[PDB]
Amino acid sequence: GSRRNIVGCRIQHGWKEGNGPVTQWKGTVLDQVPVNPSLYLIKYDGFDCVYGLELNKDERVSALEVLPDRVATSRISDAHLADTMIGKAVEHMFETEDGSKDEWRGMVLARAPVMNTWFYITYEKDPVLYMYQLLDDYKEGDLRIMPDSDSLVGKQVEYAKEDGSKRTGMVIHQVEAKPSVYFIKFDDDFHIYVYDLVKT
């Protein structure tokens, strides 16, 4: 196989979506998906979304390098807070370009692997995998804990959008909090989508 583990490693590579200027991405490899060992989840500097890329097969990933520097585990500052945070419904507040408020209703999912001071989170108006250092925003008041409150991992998945065509994907993870909620990787995109499957 890979015969060396880049989980927890710093990576950098070019992004070749065309014959123009080629951006250079730096990032931290968060996980290698058990049900698809070619798929890696990566926290890229400057991206609020976790990215899923088959880092060694994708042609968009040019001149891929793995840095010798691993990222250590920065141990939990406020463990119980962090641990009571996981799974709650939250109000996340961001400043916009103007500087006016922008409040987003979401759910904290889990503690991010590798980058241990960060939390997986997704939002109602954008059900993809975000990643934020949520302790700061909570003590700053930008985050509000709201009081409102058979693993099919490894199976293929199909959606029907407006045109009525299959969107093929795979189930890659289950949230231990809220096991009815899952991570999905579609073939056509690098975003990790978050769905509540066992909903009825």
Partner: peptide, 5 residues
């Protein structure tokens, strides 16, 4: 806006 719908 944001990241991917």
């Amino acid at each position: 806006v944001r990241k991917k719908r």
